[PDB]
Amino acid sequence: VDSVSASPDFVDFVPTIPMQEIWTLCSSEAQAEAMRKHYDDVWAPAQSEK
């Protein structure tokens, strides 16, 4: 417990804003939409299946 006070590790999310989509960080709406569209249509289905 003393070590946890000195060196806590990531254990859980803040449930209000846990993570942000990476294409929010994109330079450009065309790229960002392409990433979102591919994420929605292809990658997230595959990973949820995987």
Report in angstroms how near the CB of residue 42 gets to another protein at its nearest. 27
Scanning 1-9, 21-29, 32-40, 41-49 for contacts with another protein by CB under 8 A, the matching segment is: 1-9
Q: Identify whether the C-beta of residue 21 lies closer than 8 Å to the C-beta of residue 36.
A: yes
Q: Got the DSSP string for 1-50?
A: -HHHHHS-------TTS----GGGG-S-HHHHHHHHHHIIIIIHHHHHH-
3 or 28, CB closer to another protein?
A: 3
Contact positions with another protein (CB under 8 A) in 6-35: 7, 9-10
Residues that bind another protein (CB under 8 A): 3, 7, 9-10
